[PDB]
RNA sequence: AACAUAAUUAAUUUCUAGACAUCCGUUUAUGAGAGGAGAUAAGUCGUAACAAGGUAAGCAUACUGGAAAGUGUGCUUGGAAUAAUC
């Protein structure tokens, strides 16, 4: 899922709300939280920030 | 070369990339040298034209000649024969 979101931001393409939802749901470790925090930041600064 | 993401406010992205390459040509200038016209203006050689200009003049064309010109063939009068009679 991380790869899918990374490609979209590189191409300046919108990311789905379902995509960020799947990431947060499948957090399995303390380290994963840190990565999700970065992607929540990226989602906020993206065209579909309102759809969180 | 023209799709793809996204969508419980709605929008993002694509909507391109080479080859502007020299032409075939066309004008004008330069002019080795070879000519033409015109004028300058005292000559030189003849005397061709103007008188029937001393071979009437001229046109076309051909040939010929220092030069004007000469000669042939056809044509012109822009020559003449001012004009009663064996
Ligand atoms: K003569
Ligand atoms: K004459
Ligand atoms: Mg004479
Ligand atoms: Mg004579
Ligand atoms: Mg004469
Ligand atoms: Mg003649
Ligand atoms: Mg002769
Ligand atoms: Mg003779």
Curated annotation (Swiss-Prot):
Disulfide bonds: none annotated. Transmembrane segments: none annotated. RNA-binding component of the mitochondrial small ribosomal subunit (mt-SSU) that plays a role in mitochondrial protein synthesis. Stimulates mitochondrial mRNA translation of subunit components of the mitochondrial electron transport chain. Binds to the mitochondrial 12S rRNA (12S mt-rRNA) and tRNA(Glu). Overexpressed in hepatocellular carcinoma tissues compared with adjacent non-tumoral liver tissues. It comes from the Eukaryota. Belongs to the mitochondrion-specific ribosomal protein mS27 family. Component of the mitochondrial ribosome small subunit (28S) which comprises a 12S rRNA and about 30 distinct proteins. Interacts with NOA1. Interacts with MIEF1 upstream open reading frame protein. Interacts with METTL17. It is found in: Cytoplasm; Mitochondrion. This is Small ribosomal subunit protein mS27. The chain holds residues 53 to 104 of 415 of the full protein.
């Amino acid at each position: 899922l991380a790869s899918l979101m990374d490609k979209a931001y590189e191409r300046k393409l919108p990311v789905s709300s379902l995509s960020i939802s799947r990431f947060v749901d499948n957090i399995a470790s303390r380290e994963d939280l840190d990565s999700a925090e970065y992607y929540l930041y990226k989602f906020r600064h993206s065209p579909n920030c309102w759809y969180l």
